[PDB]
């Protein structure tokens, strides 16, 4: 009310409204799902278009051969943060000849988002991210929020109506976690998960976006006729 003019101001109950408003931009964003087994990690993203003449906004970005994310909210902010990750992943390779741990990737994003919430002039990032990766400790899935809070999960979903997919994954937890050494089945579980967040619209060929990383699989994105298999 009087305490939402900038990020540097606390409310009387101890709230940061600009951070909460940035969080609101994610809820308006299109749904995207993340889930993993012990061998692979999968991102599934519902893309959004302006109208029938327009293209569908690309939701998934590659960060390294072993890591990448999906976005929900302000796309330019995702580009900034993804670019920062690309650099940090790359720094780890050039300097230490070491693939950046997915956990450290989360720690770095947290600290970058935090600095924007404590200083005058700047603003919080207006996007949520789901980071998947395969490193020296197996498959991983992270959920980034622009408050700074990063969380490691077996599965999750963010965006509009993400609660439908998040409930499904909470039920399916025991099933999909043990889909080891089978990419197509782990994707199917993810495609079925994102379907719980659909209303009036269904998954078409230029609407669906899937990504996967794993033990013997580099981070690769599937669009167009390559995702027709899963509809």
């Amino acid at each position: 009310n009087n305490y939402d003019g900038d990020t540097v101001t606390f409310s009387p109950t101890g709230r940061l409204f600009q951070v909460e408003y940035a969080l609101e931009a994610i809820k308006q964003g299109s749904v995207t799902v993340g889930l993993r087994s012990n061998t692979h990690a999968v991102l599934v993203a519902l893309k959004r278009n302006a109208d029938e003449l327009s293209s569908y906004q690309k939701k998934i970005i590659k960060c390294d051969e072993h890591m990448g994310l999906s976005l929900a909210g302000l796309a330019p902010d995702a580009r900034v943060l993804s670019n920062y990750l690309r650099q940090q992943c790359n720094y780890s390779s050039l300097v230490f000849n070491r693939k950046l741990a997915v956990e450290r990737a989360g720690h770095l994003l947290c600290d970058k988002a935090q600095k924007n919430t404590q200083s005058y002039g700047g603003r919080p990032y207006g996007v949520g991210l789901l980071i998947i990766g395969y490193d020296k400790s197996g498959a991983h899935l992270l959920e980034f929020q622009p408050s700074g809070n990063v969380t490691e999960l077996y599965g999750t979903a963010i965006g509009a109506r993400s609660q439908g997919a998040k409930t499904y994954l909470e039920r399916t937890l025991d099933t999909f976690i043990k889909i080891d050494g089978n990419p197509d089945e782990l994707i199917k579980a993810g495609v079925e998960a994102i379907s719980q967040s659909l209303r009036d619209e269904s998954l078409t060929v230029d609407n669906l976006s899937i990504a996967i990383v794993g033990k013997d699989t580099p981070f690769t994105i599937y669009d167009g006729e390559a995702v027709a298999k899963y509809i």
Binding site: D6, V8, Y120, G121
Partner: protein
């Protein structure tokens, strides 16, 4: 952050006016009147000191009239402290020009640069403008005797006779009435004092409440002399014209 306390000094009103410039001019309108009159053979500068106290040291005082170089002087109306900042800049600018070209600075060039500085404070920096209006009286070998005025907006114009500070409206009507082009310096001296004497808010115009100066070619052959009048000299010129 600090945005909360920013006055925003360099913005436009809905009418297209600069608030701070307009208010600085309002400040200047309460300052002691200063008059400049340009004659064919010289220039007069006359200025009224702001309500004087009897214990004020009059002879070793400088409030209104300042020397920029040997050929150029200014009369001040507004904040003295602000004027002295601008005067020292103008004095330095004159010496830079002399150092560069080995020639005394043309009056307009000095006036333009000082006016350009004022302009800058109205367009950028977020600082308050200088609450000062100048009357420039000077000579160079291109245009001869010249009178100019500048104000907080950074706008300057040339004049035959002009007033700044208090009661300019009344003062300008009186100058416009009695001024003519073939006028001499000694006539301009009389006009300047007569105008102040009528427009003054004081009871009677006396020597101790005046600063006076002339820029003549009244030296010896083709050279200009600046005369900042002493207290006793103002007392005599006031008697000579029959004001006291």
């Amino acid at each position: 952050g600090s945005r909360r306390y920013d006055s925003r000094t360099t913005i436009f009103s809905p009418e297209g006016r600069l608030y701070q410039v307009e208010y600085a001019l309002e400040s200047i309108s309460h300052a002691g009147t200063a008059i400049g009159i340009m004659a064919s053979d010289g220039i007069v500068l006359a200025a009224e000191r702001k309500v004087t106290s009897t214990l004020l040291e009059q002879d070793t005082s400088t409030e209104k009239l300042y020397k920029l170089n040997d050929k150029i002087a200014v009369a001040v109306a507004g904040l003295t402290a602000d004027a002295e900042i601008l005067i020292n800049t103008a004095r330095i600018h004159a010496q830079n020009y002399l150092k560069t070209y080995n020639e005394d600075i043309p009056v307009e060039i000095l006036v333009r640069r000082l006016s350009d500085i004022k302009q800058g404070y109205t367009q950028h920096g977020g600082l308050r403008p200088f609450g000062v209006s100048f009357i420039y009286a000077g000579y160079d070998d291109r245009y001869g005797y010249q009178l100019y005025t500048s104000n907080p907006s950074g706008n300057y114009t040339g004049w035959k006779a002009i007033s700044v500070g208090a009661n300019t409206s009344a003062a300008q009507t009186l100058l416009q009435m009695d001024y003519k082009d073939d006028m001499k310096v000694d006539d301009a001296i009389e006009l300047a004092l007569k105008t102040l004497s009528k427009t003054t808010d004081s009871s009677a115009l006396t020597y101790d409440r005046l600063e006076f100066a002339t820029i003549r070619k009244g030296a010896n052959d083709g050279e200009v002399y600046q005369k900042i009048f002493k207290p006793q000299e103002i007392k005599d010129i006031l008697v000579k014209t029959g004001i006291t």
